[PDB]
DNA sequence: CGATCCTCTCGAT
RNA sequence: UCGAGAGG
């Protein structure tokens, strides 16, 4: 309460540009803070390039709370969202 | 006829024409059923607003109306075979291309549309020169133009400099 | 600037070698773009060049006085007599290669002005420093090593872009930001914080 | 303010030609064109160097200290 | 103020070597010699001379930015011809030609009066 | 070469700028706007020399 | 005036038609006149269309007016932008100006309104009526030095 | 007699007119530019002013001093101070000059380049002597003094090239024209009525045949003949400008050939 | 001697002026095509003649060469710039102690002059140099 | 292959419309009283008079980077004076059977009208045009 | 207004801007001194530690170095003063305020900021000399030039802040404008001029140049294209070599006037795959056109690929033009002899046409149409008779101008110039206006005191029969000055007004954003639109397209 | 200097426009931009 | 009760 | 601070 259950989720199945940039940002800030990486580095050292790889290999364990104007919200895991951008 | 619409269909066709190396001498492998039903099916998987209720269903139905008009007229059974000379493989690729390209064309929630609108009007308004006009050939063409006129509109001017009434 | 409403900054500096050159070895002191000329319609600039060429050659002052009877034809007549083609064009070779250019260049002397305010007098870069006493915000002017104003217009631009955090950073981390104590009953800055 | 050494454009030494120029005009009574010609200032970049020069030094020397 | 020193046009720094050989990734018998502290005087002269060799397939030079006195020279030669060799021969041919010029000029100079 | 025409106030050179004003003792007639009750006005900017 | 009207054969044609232009407005009375086409009558006074034909008709005229000013100077702005501006003035039921009288009178946040005009006085009436600011506005968050709900901040990110 | 061929027209103490036949434009140009910026010469590189009571600024004079031409005949038997193993300058790497002038006259006393005086040991090499081409014997005016006026300074002349600063140029102006008839069609003439009437003919048109009216455009033809006139400032004699030009290029080509030994 | 007269804008109203002396009062009836199109006499009841039409301009505009071959706003623009162009402001500069003083090393008198420049002492205290310039598309810099 | 098309044409018109090196040439076949040709030709290299009768050929014979023609052991498919390489851009039909093939030789356009070359000229990026005498 | 909605900030920089044809689109040329001043706080991670110590060891004065080092407790160590500056062995979790180096995201801006394109993220490129440097193609969205403009540069202090710049503000992802649903950047000046120049049918290049031009394109496949000509000398066309800069799968078709799919005039456009088939490349192809090569490449290949294209086109073109050269002289305003004769009589017969109408007005024979004065009618007739004159005289000039005419060349490319310009400079300046009417009777019944009372003749009321080449008369001059002054007044007047309009507009629409239900709402959650712009489509993802079922005959629709 | 000494200032119907009567009295060209254009005159 | 934005400099109490 | 001049 309030929320919205996983079944009946009416919002966009695709990730917004604003969602992507906010996710890539937070993960880059996480990596820079010496946080554990969830993908085998390919001679990478930049926190954004690594976060970008983590999103590409769908292993970013962050969640997005989409707020509807009534106050209600829909929780979407980065793992389920589509990146057609 | 020419209006700003999402998805450049012409571009997709030319892309299918080269990709699949279309031959204008050999007859196509398509069916009358394939074209008619295919274009009808493409007009279903198009999304702006999802939903399963009539309110949002009709709302989304209304949003695609003009784009579907373009789609119907461009992807017609005669044109698909006579003009474009599309193959089955090349046809399905066009169908799946539009569907995806359309979804990409949809505005993203969060987009600061208000600020964008204000700036979009503001910039060219600043670039307006000659508060008079360039209609100064005949003396009967004397109406408040440019920046003064834009000021009357936004202010909601009770009394305007050139109040006119054009009758048919 | 020239004497015809033509502002310009030095874009680059080339040595004598790399510069285009005349068959007699003359080389420009300055090169200006032909794209200035059409929109600005400053014909006299082109004229003063034709006359100042004819002037330096003949060893006489050029009469660039207004309401007179000096024609572009008159000047052009005298200049052909002085061995150069009547309109100011002359064969020019590429500095790097030595090959004649396809185009013939409008060469000649034009009186140019050295204007006030140079780069070094303008450059400013601040990455923290003096804060105005009252507001606790960066100071004004290059002179005091101050902050550049991120005005409403700029604030608005970031809003259009949808860069919520960057916009927050500019208004907090850079510039202002402060920590205060609020009473859960008051809602005011009443709390007498006796830290440590 | 004193004759420049060398022509800004080409580099031909000109700072040794001023007195000679001023003499040709005064003592020989001839015109600038034929004066610059006698000093061997062939090119127009060299021609302007001398012909366009305002020798303000002479005015500055009139101040006492 | 941000103005570099005029010696950086012909003077090598530290670690900066004159020639830098990097093999080309796009073509077979091709290489990219990056001549440091040099301009159009060496570039165009060597490039136009490389072209004279019947075994040279491609020869082009570029000065990527005017602020810096570098230049990249790309050579492509026939299989069984090292591009480093083509560069060697080109240089020698120039020296040979330049030599002839000096003598020829000196002979005509000594034949003059004034 | 100096032309003068200026002052020296505590070492600083001062130029007084010519101040444009409407001429005095001039009689001028003006049509007043449509809502206004007075259709025309005659004014005189009388001053003493 | 020149009119683009289709021929009996289907193709569109440049059929010229007589049109009268007025110095003055009395829309209500001029439209009831016989011989005119009351379906086509137009006035540059959008505010006059609003009181005779309704709010939705006014909105359309208001767009025609903003459009016409841009178009005249030789520029083009995508429909959606004027559409939004026009709709913003329209939504109130009548015509709300783009000045302190129009949009600044709105039910919006005291802090977001005092950022435009009549600064101190907006905050005075806010204090008097004891207004509650929901802080959902851009401006209040800019004053508060917080990440506003603008794209990037329009959603909460969690673990 | 191998590749390039030279034919000298004008021979003077200051100018050299010649024909560079059987040569590539890449070479003809490379030679022209190397003469401008890469022949080393001797020019004032540091000024120490002890007394200056003139109307001209310290740096204004210093700047002017740099431009005065000084004998560079034996510049190869002088080192670049950057290569020298001393501290600052010396005799192997520099020439020290002196300038002292005082307004002894009620009239106006002038400072010439003849008034500069060599102080350091030059060791029999022809170097440092100010270049004087004026018929009165006083080449170049440096400054003018009234009465009280006095200018006392010492200056160090150093080895260098124009590529570093224009003061180091034996250079001056180099004329360069190839194909006076535009047979190569290398340029496209701007005109109004007639190109032939509108554009004037060069003195070089006499040393070449005309286009020969109705004949097909020579496709494969390239520039092999080049008309040049090199004029010296005086620091290095004319013949030497061209020979040191040919040589400097040869040297910088050889350095690449030498870099293809170290790697 | 009353060969010249001082006239103000009010008295200007009652008089009839001629631009050129000789050209505006000789006789009536070949012509140079390059020369600008001039009206004629038409009104021949003159009271005064203009000393020189170039006198309508002032000091800053009197420095522009051929402003009559230029678009009017460019002439306005130059008049502001000429007042920011370095050069010998005064011969006694070496003696004046003042905040900001910009002086050109080798000022050059313009090769293209205006008869008005003589009274403005411009060729005596110049503010610019006679630069050899090519109008061209070189490196695109 | 070999050759795709070969015919002797006769020049009807030649015009340098604003161009000083190029000329759009109109020529019909001497044999085929229906066959037509349009061609942008470099007159600076190959001059053509308003009545010349020239032999035209299409080969697509003698992929990969161009090498300078070094005649060490080389011999191209030409005894011809004019050689051009181009690409197909449109295959139009003008009534019944009358074909129309469009070629661009780096912008130098070519249109060939006839009928017979049906199973011949294809959408090939390859197209060598050869003109002799 | 001055401290909350906007304020002065740390990590700022400002300087004169200069143009760089060798910089990339998204790049910015930052002077070394500025780079040496502006710092980015970088946390010590095993990934960077080595490069960071090296920078700490380069110190504040060698560029690829750093200033301040921050320890756990937040205490700063000043690298320009500290005795320990020499040593300093960094620990993980410590911050290193390093110098701003190559390829960093920087918010670059130009005032007035009335556009989201007046604020774009750029790639840092640290360079010598005191000016900020930029690509000519980014000049337009900022509305800058090189007469002396100054630009602002900001530096992100956090990872999320810099991510927001790279993913939302970057120059390539800003190419297509949502404002006008077309691109906001394109090929300009020398490049626009030179493209037309190179792109011609007559334009042919030889091997030596070809290879140099081929190499200049960085993304080059290393494949020498087969020349268009393989006869006496193998020649390449300008079209061929430029097509190398164009990628693959890029299809573009236009049609202008002639464009007979055999384009005899060499107009319109046809680009198939990665090659230009026919048509001269000018503003319509390579400018900020709605259906341009740019709008195509951004939509097809992507922003970063299209951004690369700006560089490629520029490099090839600028180089070819550096060797071809282009000028403009006084000779280009010289408009023949017989053409001038026709121009003169064109104005002369317009002058007679005016006199006759004046005479008819004077005879009271003329009658004005309903609604307007006999005087009101008379004026607008003379006004038209005189505009016709300047235009006819101008057309006469434009026709006489040769293909070689450098002004004609600039207009033809669309680089610089309009008809008006040709007309005023070489044929006739024309009639002058103030308050939208011809020169007023300022003096009692006269424009000037050199005229008689009650004189309505063209010349007397502000008509300038002379060109800028011929020169203006004293009267003509003054009248042109009067008109010119009006321009400058209402230039300043307009700017001061439109500024107030912009803030009002912005403040009114601040809070309007597309929500998570395609609903366009304000700060109160009040619905403005149900679908953004009546379709819920993004402005930059749209283009004008022909609806084929609306036009054509009933017969045509059927077949 | 000269241009400064010959300046005019006009405080506060259309003062900015170059009036007909200004002929030979005030300069038609020389005037500042924006702020006080046409109000600041030069003799 | 607003009347562009941002930037620079000097001088005076 | 208030005041003037200037730059886009
Ligand atoms: Mg500007
Ligand atoms: Zn409390
Ligand atoms: Zn010279
Ligand atoms: Zn030593």
Residue I72 in contact with residue L29, Cβ under 8 Å?
yes
Q: How far apart are CA A17 and CA K208, in angstroms?
A: 47
Between chains, do H55 and I94 touch, taking CB under 8 Å as contact? Answer: yes
- Give the number of other CB atoms < 10 A from CB of residue D7: 22
Element (H, E) at K305: helix K303-324
Resolution of this deposited model, Å: 3.2
Which DSSP string do the residues of chain B spell out, in sequence order? Answer: -EEEESS-HHHHHHHHHHHTT--SSSPP---HHHHHHHHHHHTTS--SS--SSHHHHHHHHHHHHHHHHHHHHHS-HHHHHTTS---HHHHHHHHHHHHHHHHHHBPPTT--HHHHHHHHHHHHHHT---SS-S-TTSTT-----HHHHHHHHHHT-SS-SS-EEEE-
Q: How far apart are CA K321 and CA I140, in angstroms?
A: 9
Measured in angstroms, what separates residue K418's CA from nucleotide N8's C1'?
A: 25
In our burial notation (b when 16+ CB lie closer than 10 A, e otherwise), range H235-258 reads bbbbbbbbbbbbbbbbebbeebee
Closest residue to M5 by CA to C1' distance?
K112
Is C186 labeled as ligand-binding?
yes
Chain B nearest C-alpha distance from G21 (Å): 5
Between chains, do K229 and J45 touch, taking CB under 8 Å as contact? Answer: yes
Q: How far apart are CA I65 and CA C70, in angstroms?
A: 12
**Of H185, I110, I111, H204, which is closest to residue C24 (Cα–Cα)?**
H204
Structure tokens at H238: 């004319």
Residue G27 in contact with residue G49, Cβ under 8 Å?
yes
Which residues from F are below 8 Å from I121, CB to CB?
A: 1
Topology (CATH) of C131-196: DCoH-like (3.90.1800)
The class level of CATH for E1-114 reads alpha beta
* Closest nucleotide to K111: CA versus each C1': M6
Selected residues 48-77 of chain I with any CB under 8 Å from a CB in chain C: 52-54, 57, 63-71, 73-77
- Give the number of other CB atoms < 10 A from CB of residue K462: 24
Q: What angle do CA K255, K258, K260 make, to 5 degrees?
A: 75
Q: How far apart are CA J23 and CA J21, in angstroms?
A: 7
Closest residue to M8 by CA to C1' distance?
C122
Q: Please check whether residue K488 touches I, CB under 8 A.
A: yes
Length of chain B: 168
Q: How far apart are CA D63 and CA C4, in angstroms?
A: 37
Q: Ligand 1 centre from C7 Cα, in Å?
A: 8
**Of K149, E67, K16, K151, which is closest to residue C12 (Cα–Cα)?**
E67
Which residues from B are below 8 Å from C157, CB to CB?
A: 119
Interface with chain K: mutation pick from I38, I41, I44, I68, highest number of K CBs within 10 Å: I68
Q: How far apart are CA H44 and CA H116, in angstroms?
A: 11
Distances from the Cα of C114 to the Cαs of A47, C111, I75, I128, K370, in angstroms?
49, 10, 18, 6, 61
Owner of token pair 């009040």? K526
Residue H101 in contact with residue H75, Cβ under 8 Å?
no
Domains of chain J are 1-133 (2.40.50.140)
Domains of chain H are 1-40+167-263 (3.30.1360.10), 41-166 (2.170.120.12)
- Residue H67 has its nearest CB partner, among D6, D20, D43, at D6
CATH classification at residue A35 = 3.90.940.10
Residue K476 in contact with residue K424, Cβ under 8 Å?
no
What distance lies between CA K225 and its chain's CA centroid? 33
**Of H39, H223, H2, which is closest to residue E102 (Cα–Cα)?**
H2
Query: The domain containing residue D64 runs over which residues?
Result: 1-65
Q: Which residues have CB less than 5 Å away from ligand 2 (the ion)?
A: C 183, 185-186, 190
Residue C102 in contact with residue K406, Cβ under 8 Å?
no
Q: Please check whether residue I12 touches L, CB under 8 A.
A: yes
What are the contacts of K270-274 at 24+ separation with CB within 8 A?
K270/J89, K271/K243, K271/K246, K272/B18, K272/J87, K272/J89, K273/B18, K273/K248, K273/K249, K274/K243, K274/K246, K274/K247, K274/K248, K274/K249, K274/K250
Distances from the Cα of H246 to the Cαs of B36, H59, H251, K329, in angstroms?
80, 36, 9, 38
Interface with chain G: mutation pick from B6, B136, B162, B163, highest number of G CBs within 10 Å: B163
Structure tokens at E5: 């020193």
Is the link from the previous residue into A2 a cis peptide, with omega within 30 of 0? yes
Is D45 labeled as ligand-binding?
yes
Between chains, do H60 and I94 touch, taking CB under 8 Å as contact? Answer: no
Q: How far apart are CA B69 and CA K412, in angstroms?
A: 39
Q: Ligand 3 centre from I129 Cα, in Å?
A: 14
Q: Ligand 1 centre from K144 Cα, in Å?
A: 6
Helix (H, G, I), strand (E, B) or coil at K222: coil
Structure tokens at H105: 């006259």
Is K149 labeled as ligand-binding?
yes
Measured in angstroms, what separates residue G104's CA from nucleotide M3's C1'?
A: 18
Measured in angstroms, what separates residue G131's CA from nucleotide M2's C1'?
A: 26
Chain H nearest C-alpha distance from E22 (Å): 12
Q: Residue I79: closest CA among chain L residues belongs to which residue?
A: L30
Residue H131 in contact with residue H71, Cβ under 8 Å?
yes
- Give the number of other CB atoms < 10 A from CB of residue J54: 21
Segments in K401-473 forming alpha helices (H): 406-413, 419-426
Q: How far apart are CA C44 and CA C36, in angstroms?
A: 13
Q: How far apart are CA K106 and CA K125, in angstroms?
A: 10
CATH classification at residue D19 = 1.10.10.60
A near B: at least 3 beta-carbon pairs less than 8 Å apart: yes
Q: How far apart are CA B45 and CA B102, in angstroms?
A: 10
Could you say which DSSP state residue E91 is in?
H
Structure tokens at H106: 């009620």
Beta pairing, strands F40-44 & F27-31: antiparallel
Structure tokens at K26: 């998204």
Structure tokens at K150: 């100054």
Between chains, do A29 and K159 touch, taking CB under 8 Å as contact? Answer: yes
For chain C, after which residues does the C atom lie more than 2.5 Å from the next written residue's N, i.e. where is it broken? none
- Residue A25 has its nearest CB partner, among K42, K43, K164, at K164
Estimate the share of chain E in helix, then strand, then coil, as percent rounded to the nearest 5: 40, 20, 45
Q: How far apart are CA K4 and CA G41, in angstroms?
A: 49
3-class SS letters over H206-254: HHCCCCCCCCCCCCCCCCCCCEEEEECCCCCCHHHHHHHHHHHHHHHHH
Residue K327 in contact with residue H187, Cβ under 8 Å?
no
Q: What angle do CA H218, H223, H226 make, to 5 degrees?
A: 140
Owner of token pair 């066959």? J35
Q: Which residues have CB less than 5 Å away from ligand 3 (the ion)?
A: D 7, 9-10, 12, 43, 45-46
The experimental technique used to determine this model is X-ray
Q: Residue D58: closest CA among chain I residues belongs to which residue?
A: I91
N strand bases under 7 Å from protein CB: 5-8
Is the shortest CB-to-strand distance from G44 to strand M under 7 Å? no
Beta pairing, strands K12-19 & K132-134: parallel
Measured in angstroms, what separates residue K23's CA from nucleotide M5's C1'?
A: 28
Element (H, E) at H46: strand H41-52
Q: How far apart are CA I12 and CA I16, in angstroms?
A: 8
Q: How far apart are CA K396 and CA C61, in angstroms?
A: 36
Chain B nearest C-alpha distance from C10 (Å): 28
Q: How far apart are CA H178 and CA H26, in angstroms?
A: 13
The class level of CATH for K189-324 reads mainly alpha
What distance lies between CA J8 and its chain's CA centroid? 11
Structure tokens at C176: 């202002």
Element (H, E) at G64: helix G55-73
Residue I12 in contact with residue L21, Cβ under 8 Å?
yes
> Which-ligand-closest: CA of D47?
3
All residues at 6 or more sequence positions from K250 whose CB lies less than 8 Å from its CB, including other chains: K271, K273, K274, K293, K296, K297, K300, K301
**Of B104, G91, B63, which is closest to residue K533 (Cα–Cα)?**
B63
Length of chain K: 559
All residues at 6 or more sequence positions from C59 whose CB lies less than 8 Å from its CB, including other chains: D31, D32, D33, D34, D35, D36, D37, D47, D51
Is the shortest CB-to-strand distance from I100 to strand M under 7 Å? yes
Length of chain J: 133
Q: How far apart are CA K1 and CA E68, in angstroms?
A: 46
> How many distinct structural domains can be found in chain A?
1
Selected residues 20-39 of chain B with any CB under 8 Å from a CB in chain K: none
Which DSSP string do the residues of chain J spell out, in sequence order? Answer: ---SEEEEEEEEEEE-SS-SSEEEEEEEESS-SS-EEEEEEETTTS---TT-EEEEEE-S----------TTS---S-S-SEEEE-EEEEEEE-STT-EEEEEEETTEEEEEE-SS-SSS--S-S--EEEEE-
Owner of token pair 């998987």? B45
Owner of token pair 């010119």? K484
């Amino acid at each position: 309460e309030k929320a919205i259950p996983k079944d009946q989720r009416a919002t966009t199945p695709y990730m917004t540009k604003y969602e992507r940039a906010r996710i890539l940002g937070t993960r880059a800030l996480q990596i820079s803070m010496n946080a554990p990486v969830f993908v085998d580095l390919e001679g990478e050292t930049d926190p954004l390039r690594i976060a970008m790889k983590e999103l590409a290999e769908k292993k970013i364990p962050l969640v997005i709370r989409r707020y509807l104007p009534d106050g209600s919200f829909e929780d979407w895991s980065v793992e389920e969202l589509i990146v057609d951008l | 006829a020419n209006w700003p619409l999402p998805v450049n269909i012409r571009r997709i066709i030319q892309n299918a024409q080269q990709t699949f190396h279309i031959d204008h001498t050999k007859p196509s492998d398509l069916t009358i059923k394939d074209i008619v039903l295919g274009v009808k099916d493409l007009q279903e998987n198009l999304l702006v607003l999802r939903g399963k209720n009539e309110i949002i269903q009709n709302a989304q139905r209304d949003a695609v109306t003009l784009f579907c008009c373009l789609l119907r007229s461009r992807l017609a059974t005669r044109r698909v075979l006579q003009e474009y000379r599309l193959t089955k493989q090349a046809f399905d690729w066009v169908l799946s291309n539009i569907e995806a390209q359309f979804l990409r064309s949809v505005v993203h929630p969060g987009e600061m549309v208000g600020v964008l609108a204000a700036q979009s009007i503001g910039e060219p308004a600043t670039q307006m020169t000659l508060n008079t006009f360039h209609f100064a050939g005949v003396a009967s063409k004397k109406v408040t133009s440019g920046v003064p006129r834009l000021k009357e509109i936004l202010n909601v001017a009770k009394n305007m400099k050139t109040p006119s009434l054009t009758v048919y | 600037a020239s004497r015809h409403g033509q502002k310009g900054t030095i874009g680059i500096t080339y040595r004598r070698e790399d510069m285009p050159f005349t068959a007699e070895g003359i080389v420009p002191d300055l090169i200006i773009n032909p794209h200035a000329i059409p929109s600005r319609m400053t014909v006299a600039h082109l004229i003063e060049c034709l006359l100042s060429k004819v002037a330096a050659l003949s060893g006489n002052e050029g009469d660039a006085s207004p309401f007179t009877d000096i024609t572009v034809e008159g000047i052009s007549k005298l200049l052909r007599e002085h061995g150069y083609q009547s309109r100011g064009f002359e064969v020019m070779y590429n500095g790097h290669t030595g090959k004649k250019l396809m185009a013939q260049i409008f060469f000649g002397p034009t009186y140019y002005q050295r204007l006030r305010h140079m780069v070094d007098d303008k450059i400013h870069a601040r990455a923290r420093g003096p804060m105005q006493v009252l507001t606790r915000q960066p100071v004004e002017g290059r002179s005091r090593d101050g902050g550049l104003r991120f005005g409403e217009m700029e604030r608005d631009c970031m809003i259009a872009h949808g860069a919520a955090s960057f916009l927050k950073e500019r208004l907090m981390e850079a510039s202002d930001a402060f920590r205060v104590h609020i009473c859960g009953i008051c809602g005011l800055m009443t709390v007498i914080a006796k830290l440590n | 303010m004193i004759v420049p050494v060398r022509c800004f454009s080409c580099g031909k030494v000109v700072g040794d030609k001023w007195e000679s120029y001023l003499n040709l005009l005064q003592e020989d009574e001839l015109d600038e064109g034929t004066a610059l010609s006698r000093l061997g200032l062939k090119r127009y970049c060299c021609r302007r160097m001398i012909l366009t020069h305002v020798d303000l030094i002479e005015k500055f020397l009139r101040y006492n200290p | 103020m941000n103005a570099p020193d005029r010696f950086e046009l012909f003077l090598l720094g530290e670690g900066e070597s004159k020639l830098k050989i990097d093999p080309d990734t796009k073509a077979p018998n091709a290489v990219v010699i990056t001549f440091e502290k040099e301009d159009h005087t060496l570039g165009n002269l060597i490039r136009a001379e490389l072209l004279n060799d019947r075994k040279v397939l491609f020869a082009a030079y570029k000065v990527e930015h005017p602020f810096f006195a570098r230049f990249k020279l790309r050579i492509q030669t026939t299989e069984g011809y090292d591009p480093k060799d083509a560069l060697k021969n080109a240089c020698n041919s120039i020296i040979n030609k330049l030599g002839a010029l000096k003598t020829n000029f000196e002979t005509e100079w000594n034949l003059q009066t004034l | 070469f100096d032309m003068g025409g200026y002052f020296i106030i505590n070492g600083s050179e001062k130029v007084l700028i010519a101040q444009e004003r409407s001429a005095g003792n001039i009689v001028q007639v003006f049509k007043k706007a449509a809502p206004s009750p007075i259709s025309h006005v005659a004014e005189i900017r009388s001053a003493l020399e | 005036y020149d009119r683009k009207v289709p021929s009996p054969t289907g193709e569109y044609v440049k059929e010229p038609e007589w049109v009268l232009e007025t110095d003055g407005v009395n829309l209500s009375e001029v439209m009831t006149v016989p011989g005119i086409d009351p379906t086509r009558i137009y006035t540059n006074s959008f505010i006059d269309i609003m009181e005779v034909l309704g709010i939705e008709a006014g909105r359309a005229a208001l767009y025609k007016e903003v459009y016409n000013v841009i178009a005249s100077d030789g520029s083009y702005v995508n429909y959606r932008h004027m559409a939004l501006l026009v709709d913003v003035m329209t939504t109130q039921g009548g015509l709300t100006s783009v000045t302190r009288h129009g949009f600044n009178r709105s039910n919006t946040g005291a802090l977001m309104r005092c950022s435009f005009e009549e600064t101190v006085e907006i905050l005075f009436e806010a204090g008097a009526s004891a207004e509650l600011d929901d802080c959902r506005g851009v401006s209040e968050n800019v004053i508060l030095g917080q990440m506003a709900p603008i794209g990037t901040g329009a959603f909460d990110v969690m673990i | 007699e191998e590749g390039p061929q030279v034919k000298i027209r004008e021979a003077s103490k200051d100018n050299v007119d010649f024909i560079l036949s059987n040569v590539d434009l890449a070479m003809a140009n490379s030679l022209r530019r190397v003469m401008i910026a890469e022949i080393p010469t001797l020019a004032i590189d540091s000024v120490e002013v002890e007394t200056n009571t003139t109307v001209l600024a310290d740096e204004f004079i210093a700047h002017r001093l740099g431009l005065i031409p000084l004998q560079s005949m034996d510049i190869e038997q002088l080192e670049y101070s950057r290569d020298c193993f001393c501290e600052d300058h010396c005799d192997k790497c520099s020439v020290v000059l002196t300038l002292q002038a005082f307004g002894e006259s009620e009239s106006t006393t002038n400072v010439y380049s003849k008034d500069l005086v060599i102080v350091s040991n030059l060791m029999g090499r022809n170097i440092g002597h100010p270049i004087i081409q004026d018929k009165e014997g006083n080449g170049v005016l440096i400054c003018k003094l009234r009465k009280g006026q006095e200018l006392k300074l010492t200056c160090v002349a150093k080895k260098g090239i124009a590529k570093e600063h224009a003061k180091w140029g034996p250079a001056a102006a180099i004329e360069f024209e190839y194909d006076p008839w535009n047979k190569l069609k290398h340029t496209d003439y701007w005109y109004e009525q007639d190109s032939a009437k509108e554009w004037p003919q060069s003195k070089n048109c006499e040393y070449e045949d005309p286009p020969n009216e109705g004949d097909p455009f020579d496709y494969k033809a390239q520039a092999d003949t080049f008309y040049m006139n090199v004029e010296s400032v005086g620091s290095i004699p004319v013949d030497q400008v061209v020979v040191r030009g040919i040589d400097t290029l040869q040297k910088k080509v050889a350095s690449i050939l030498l870099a293809l030994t170290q790697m | 001697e009353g060969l010249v007269e001082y006239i103000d804008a009010e008295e200007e109203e009652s008089i009839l002026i001629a631009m050129q002396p000789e050209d505006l009062e000789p006789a009536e009836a070949d012509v140079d095509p390059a020369k600008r199109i001039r009206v004629s006499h038409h009104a021949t009841t003159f009271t005064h003649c203009e000393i020189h039409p170039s006198m309508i301009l002032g000091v800053a505009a009197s420095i522009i060469p051929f402003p009559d071959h230029n678009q009017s706003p460019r002439n306005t623009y130059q008049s502001a710039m000429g007042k920011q162009a370095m050069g010998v402001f005064l011969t006694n500069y070496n003696v004046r102690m003042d905040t900001m003083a910009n002086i050109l090393y080798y000022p050059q008198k313009p090769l293209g002059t205006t008869r008005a420049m003589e009274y403005l002492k411009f060729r005596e205290l110049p503010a610019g140099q006679n630069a050899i310039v090519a109008i061209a598309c070189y490196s695109g810099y | 292959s070999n050759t795709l098309f070969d015919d002797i044409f006769q020049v009807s018109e030649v015009d340098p419309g604003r161009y000083n090196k190029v000329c759009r040439i109109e020529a019909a076949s001497t044999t085929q009283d229906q066959c037509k040709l349009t061609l942008d030709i470099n007159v600076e290299l190959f001059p053509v008079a308003a009545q010349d009768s020239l032999t035209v050929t299409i080969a697509s014979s003698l992929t990969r980077s161009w090498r300078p023609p070094q005649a060490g052991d080389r011999s191209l498919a030409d005894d011809y004076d004019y050689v051009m390489y181009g690409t197909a851009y449109k295959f139009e039909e003008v009534s019944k059977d009358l074909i129309a093939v469009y070629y661009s030789f780096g912008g130098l356009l070519m249109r060939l009208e006839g009928n017979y070359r049906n199973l011949n000229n294809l959408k090939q990026e390859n197209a060598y045009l050869l003109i002799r005498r | 207004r001055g401290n909350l909605m906007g304020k002065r900030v740390d990590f700022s920089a400002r300087t004169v801007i200069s143009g760089d044809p060798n910089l990339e689109l998204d790049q910015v040329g930052v002077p070394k001194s500025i780079a040496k001043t502006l710092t980015y706080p970088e946390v010590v991670t095993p990934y960077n530690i080595d490069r960071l110590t090296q920078l700490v060891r380069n110190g504040p004065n060698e560029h690829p170095g750093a200033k301040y080092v921050i320890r756990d407790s937040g205490d700063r160590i000043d690298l320009r003063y500290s005795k320990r500056a020499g040593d300093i062995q960094l620990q993980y979790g410590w911050k290193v305020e390093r110098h701003i180096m190559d390829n960093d995201p920087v918010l670059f801006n130009r005032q007035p900021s009335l556009h989201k394109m007046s604020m774009m993220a750029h790639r840092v490129k640290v360079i010598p000399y005191s000016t900020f440097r930029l690509n000519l193609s980014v000049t337009s969205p900022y509305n800058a030039d090189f007469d002396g403009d100054e630009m602002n540069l900001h530096v992100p202090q956090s990872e999320e802040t810099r991510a927001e710049l790279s993913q939302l503000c970057a120059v390539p992802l800003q190419i297509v404008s949502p404002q006008s649903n077309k691109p906001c950047m394109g090929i300009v000046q020398d490049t626009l001029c030179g493209i037309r120049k190179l792109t011609l049918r007559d334009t042919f290049i030889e091997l030596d140049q070809v290879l140099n031009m081929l190499y200049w394109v960085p993304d080059w496949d290393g494949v020498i294209p087969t020349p268009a000509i393989i006869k006496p000398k193998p020649l390449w066309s300008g079209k061929q070599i430029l097509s190398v800069a164009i990628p693959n799968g890029i299809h573009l078709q236009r049609f202008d006037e002639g464009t007979t799919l055999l384009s005899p005039k060499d107009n319109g456009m046809l680009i198939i795959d990665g090659q230009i088939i026919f048509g001269v490349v000018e503003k319509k192809t390579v400018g900020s056109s709605n259906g341009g090569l740019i709008h195509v490449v951004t939509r097809e290949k992507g922003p970063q690929v299209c951004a690369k294209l700006f560089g490629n086109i520029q490099k090839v073109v600028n180089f070819w033009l550096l060797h071809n050269g282009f000028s403009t002289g006084i000779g280009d305003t010289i408009a023949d002899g017989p053409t001038m004769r026709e121009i003169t009589e064109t104005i002369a017969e317009a002058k007679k046409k005016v006199l006759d109408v004046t005479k008819e007005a004077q005879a009271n024979l003329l009658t004005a149409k309903h609604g307007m004065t006999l005087r009101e009618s008379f004026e607008d007739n003379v006004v038209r008779f005189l505009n016709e004159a300047r235009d006819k005289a101008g057309r006469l000039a434009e026709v006489n101008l040769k293909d070689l005419n450098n002004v004609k060349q600039m207009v033809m490319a669309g680089s610089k110039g309009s008809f008006i310009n040709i007309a005023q400079m070489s044929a006739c300046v024309g009639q002058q206006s103030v308050e939208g009417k011809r020169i007023a009777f300022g003096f009692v019944d006269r424009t000037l005191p050199h005229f008689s009372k009650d004189d309505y003749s063209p010349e007397s009321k502000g008509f300038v029969e002379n060109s800028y080449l011929r020169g203006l008369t004293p009267q003509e001059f003054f009248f042109h000055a009067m008109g010119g002054r009006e321009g400058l007044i209402d230039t300043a007047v307009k700017t001061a007004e439109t500024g107030y309009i912009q803030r009002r507009l912005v403040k009114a629409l601040e809070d309007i954003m597309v929500h998570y239900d395609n609903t366009t709402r304000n700060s109160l959650g009040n619905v403005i639109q149900f679908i953004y712009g009546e379709d819920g489509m993004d402005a930059a993802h749209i283009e004008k397209q022909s609806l084929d079922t609306i036009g054509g005959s009933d017969a045509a629709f059927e077949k | 200097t000269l241009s400064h000494l010959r300046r005019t200032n006009t405080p506060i119907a259309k003062p900015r426009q170059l009036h007909n009567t200004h002929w030979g009295l005030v300069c038609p060209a020389e005037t500042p931009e924006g702020q006080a254009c046409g109000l600041v005159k030069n003799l």
